[PDB]
Symmetry: D2
Subunit: 341 residues, 4 copies
């Protein structure tokens, strides 16, 4: 009963998030098992550093999980846009583990980056959706994310499934640490609840439809403010708004230096986020605030819109925070007469 | 003779570039000596990775030099914005060399990041303009860039930082036979930089005309860049934002086919870096995409180059230098653009 | 009651082994806490490699524990004799952790080696018995082995306490590993029983006095055969016989190549090549002295010295004791004043 | 003309040393080129550490060149005996470069160690004489040392050819260093002279024959004292004496123990000391004085013209040309090969 494949795929996320984890997480014993990697983990872990390489929304899923990889593994992790990585002729060597994220497994720049790394003797790992695609075959090992086919022209469920697979990879790499056992358990217990929480967040759609019916839909640009874990969410929202809604958007690191969406969930509620919000409300700017259920980020003596989402484990919050942006980008396009498919 | 300190500081760059290099480069024998790091180089060469950490324009000078560091040293180099590095609580260890770049040597987020790295046992290196400032005192070793005071947003500090960082990369790679020719190339290039900066500064009249005829009334402008000139595009955007109080965004040229450029107005000001060092197919496609929609791009390119036709555009020509140095010349017209946009708006840039 | 200090210090080892562990191992919870290293462990784990540097018997305690360091930490471990390390001018860097083992903390080549590594920016760790000695002060961090003063001329209790301290250091480095938890616990429970097992091994003394009253004390050379964990023990037994008994001795890697002989044949190091070497000796009616675990029959004429079975990597602590007593009684029989 | 293949192989070393270097060293321009390692050098360097693994005399060739590998490359280098490496189950990983030195390419413990390292993801490099042997096939890359077939039961020319190949490997690894160029040129010019210097050393055979017919023949044991570069040579001399001459021998780190074996030796115990300038340490001189003070009459291997022991006190000298310090072992080993050979002939052993 969906208008477009994009809307269908947004609403499939409870199922795709569940399918990504299926048969890979023992939620009772708190054990992650990635069959595709299991013989390789000890080698993956013995590298000088990890380089995540991807394009577009897949590059965003790398940004969204970089912190949790560095936290859990204590291996340096850098995140590269495949085209820029190639542009700079970035040296890579036998001691590098290069992790390629791609829904299609066919993106030309990701393929060229893969071949470049392979030629230089690096160990390569694919986080891929299309089973047996080029990137899937040509990487040494990997995880098929099992999101199902993506027929929309923009990444929705691929993003949240990539992000989950990447978190499972980080957990897998760090499964031998006693000191990080509590953190592992917390994240694993949080993952179990994500699919039902995504269902809850999808219930924002009517509020989001009301917002996109407003003069929000005739704006020439929309800025998204975020920091920490939620900066990747800001960049991904802005990509979706440009690509889907044909509206200019920019994801801005909040407070570092027209409608505004600010991420103010607890995981990323920094003093600089508060002061950036306060700057907008000082000029009576009417921001749209994504925050956790029950938190009053702005008092009622300032006009603002709130989009409340469940609180999850800090490094998983982006899984839920992205959903309203996917929905906004979709409804803005529909109100603007755009066929998003 | 100058209306503002900012204008003085821009015009000072041939002299500040020369003073940054003074006593440090033997241009005849192609040898770089940085006294403050001399004895620490073998230790820096040895680390797991180099993390460059800075705020604002100093963060851009790190982006502008990341590639040549990687190329000359084959040591991994990442570039972190000080506040974001602290927000992610990025792990740092004894085997990291952390390089802190700061004009003032006093920026709170840079000092906080320094303290975090010191506490974790990392080796710390300062690239600082204010001698004996907190950052200078608290780093293990470093290079005072010797650019002189800034009373103006960073202009001569950016070029001097970028030069100091290039000198640092050359020092780290001074024992390599295979890199000897690339070293010589860059050092001979550096020798010519101060006079080429003098040359680029001659664009100011063309720039004042362009601001008076196409830019003053504008609300936003976009900068397109890729490779070595992506940092330049980010820095130009920051200058335009901070100095001129106009919206600006640096855009990775041609990365998105259906991104901002598929969205732009016909009259929106767009500056493209199209110097030979960063003249990628994706840069040409981006320019095309503007040119077909009847935008008239402002093309920064090398002297004599014909980047586009028939097709209406403004050209700002700059001398060709070594690829990894071209950003030193390319930033200068953006400094001048941002300055003139601001004064034509009654804004006090000092 | 003891005839010599060396004899007293051998017999003191149940107590010095306990004292070395005292306040540092929780045996019910299987937790090792070394207060000297507490805040430095995370840095030591980070390094490119560990270099253990020492002289004489202290060099042997590094060979004796190299394998367990490697096994538990997965960090490359090399073992260097201080003088030879200096002789090769072996390069050292910021990313090396250099571990210095010294009873006295004053040995000239060990000091010169420490100063060399310090100048080169390495992280330095001392395993030292004399509190506040040069090596204790000048290392960045370390563990005082708490063996008490050594008055005897040769290292006895210092060897076994060094070896225990080094094992505790390996356990501390690997205390964050889930996969090594089982092995950790095994080694910790083993360590708990070491002092009482040393008491038991000391009861071999009469058997060893009988052996040293024989024509064994009139021999020109004594060969010690070992492999694996027990190769260090063979080297240390050879050193003791030369230095105390004034009898030539060599520790030989058993059966590597194609006269009294002592063979280490405890279960931890009972390789095919050891059994082959032993069979070569018996085939020529050589009459070996076999050190082996209580109840084991290694050969069906020979002398057997039985020692309790402990965890493989701790067996060296018990196997060295009969060599200490053999070297001591051979000396007494040969009229040498060991003190 | 030779009595035995072993004698032939010893006297063949000028030719085998030349053949190992042939087509690999430009002595004019000081360039080392090892085709087998060509495009692997940048990868070999990019490692946490180098592990040299071998058995018997091949393990000695690794000990003899460890110091120069460490000096030229600044990569950690450890040397392991293949059987002991296996006994310890020493952990090996993807970031290790494991270098296997083997004349035959078929020694069981070296092959087992290789399989262990291969399955753990390490990069493996063979320094092998028998072309297409198991070790040569199974390593990722390597250098065939080109010594020619070795028919004698004990390694002679394979030792000096292995040692030379390992030095060439060390030079290849460090060929991009400006600060190393002078040391590289010094060693390469040294190497060019080694074949003719080996011929000079072989002129010692008459003196050695005489010595092996002496009161030396009747003794049951021989100690060798060495330090630094020449410790490997002392160990290799001891192996040759044990394995060929069937006499007890031990190589001793000279002057390490003030009251070790040297305080126990009989007046007439045969002792060879290496006292060439590259390894002429104060402790070596101390060890030598300890022997002569007890009326021992040592055999001194020293450089042409050097007076290590006063002519007042009764000692034998075997003089060898001086070469670059890290190459002196190539010359110092020759008299031990000849001594082991003639001791054996004088005792009736068939060395073949
Ligand atoms: C593709 C396939 O047959 N998967 C099977 C696999 O799933 P399982 O989840 O174990 O494995 P994946 O589908 O993730 O990976 C399949 C293989 O492809 C490799 N790989 C994967 C992605 C990538 O980008 N690069 C890459 O090299 C992996 O290393 C692995 O060898 O076992 C399950 C039974 O337990 C089956 O239900 C799945 O049908
Ligand atoms: C401060 C000083 O006397 N500098 C002198 C020094 O300059 P030189 O250029 O050699 O050294 P710098 O001024 O760059 O640095 C001075 C000291 O500060 C340290 N440092 C520097 C910057 C930093 O951020 N952190 C930090 O720790 C350096 O390691 C060094 O120990 O020799 C020159 C002659 O060749 C003189 O003309 C300079 O006046
Ligand atoms: C010397 C000292 O006062 N030790 C005290 C310490 O023992 P504890 O066992 O905690 O500490 P150690 O005696 O092993 O070491 C003391 C200090 O010396 C350093 N160190 C040690 C050896 C070495 O070779 N190099 C080196 O630098 C350590 O890093 C530490 O800072 O706390 C105990 C109470 O909890 C006290 O009973 C001990 O008296
Ligand atoms: C055996 C062979 O055909 N050698 C040829 C090789 O000599 P060149 O000296 O170049 O190479 P080597 O004989 O040393 O090595 C031959 C091949 O075997 C490999 N390798 C070698 C030893 C080892 O232990 N492991 C191992 O994998 C090498 O990486 C190489 O691929 O090219 C020359 C052309 O210039 C020819 O004159 C030689 O006839
Ligand atoms: O779908 C989008 C955005 O909604 C594109 O940005 C892709 O994310 C990018 O082209 C990478 O594609 P894959 O490599 O993941 O197939
Ligand atoms: O001047 C500017 C931009 O022109 C500021 O954004 C500074 O670059 C930033 O505040 C860092 O300052 P320093 O740490 O380099 O002193
Ligand atoms: O005692 C012995 C042997 O029984 C000597 O070999 C010492 O072991 C050596 O002199 C190092 O002494 P320390 O550095 O441990 O004090
Ligand atoms: O030759 C001898 C002694 O002269 C043996 O010690 C071999 O050196 C050893 O068996 C290794 O054999 P290879 O691996 O080099 O073929
Ligand atoms: Na694959
Ligand atoms: Na300083
Ligand atoms: Na200390
Ligand atoms: Na091969």
């Amino acid at each position: 009963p969906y208008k477009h494949f994009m809307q269908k795929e947004i609403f499939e996320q409870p199922d795709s998030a569940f399918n990504t984890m299926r048969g890979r997480i023992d939620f009772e014993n708190c054990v992650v098992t990635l069959g595709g990697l299991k013989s390789w983990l000890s080698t993956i872990r013995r590298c000088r550093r990890i380089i995540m390489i991807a394009c577009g929304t897949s590059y965003h899923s790398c940004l969204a999980t970089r912190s949790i990889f560095e936290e859990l593994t204590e291996i340096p992790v850098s995140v590269e846009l495949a085209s820029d990585f190639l542009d700079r002729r970035s040296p890579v060597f036998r001691d590098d583990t290069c992790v390629f994220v791609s829904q299609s497994g066919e993106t030309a720049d990701s393929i060229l980056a893969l071949q470049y790394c392979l030629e230089r003797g690096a160990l390569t790992v694919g986080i891929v959706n299309s089973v047996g695609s080029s990137m899937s075959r040509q990487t040494h090992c990997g995880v098929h994310i099992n999101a199902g086919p993506e027929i929309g022209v923009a990444s929705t469920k691929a993003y949240t499934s990539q992000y989950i697979a990447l978190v499972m990879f980080a957990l897998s790499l760090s499964n031998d640490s006693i000191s990080r056992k509590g953190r592992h358990e917390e994240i694993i217990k949080g993952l179990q609840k994500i699919p039902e929480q995504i269902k809850q967040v999808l219930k924002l759609e009517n509020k989001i439809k009301d917002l996109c019916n407003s003069s929000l839909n005739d704006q020439k640009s929309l800025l998204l403010l975020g920091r920490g874990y939620q900066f990747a969410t800001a960049l991904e929202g802005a990509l979706k708004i440009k690509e889907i809604s044909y509206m200019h958007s920019e994801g801005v690191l909040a407070g570092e230096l027209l409608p505004i969406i600010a991420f103010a969930t607890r995981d990323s509620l920094f003093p600089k986020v508060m002061s950036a919000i306060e700057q907008v409300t000082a000029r009576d700017g009417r921001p749209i605030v994504i925050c956790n259920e029950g938190d009053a980020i702005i008092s009622n003596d300032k006009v603002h819109t709130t989009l409340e989402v469940p609180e999850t484990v800090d490094c998983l919050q982006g899984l839920l925070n992205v959903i309203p942006l996917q929905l906004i980008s979709y409804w803005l396009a529909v109100n603007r007469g755009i066929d998003v498919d």
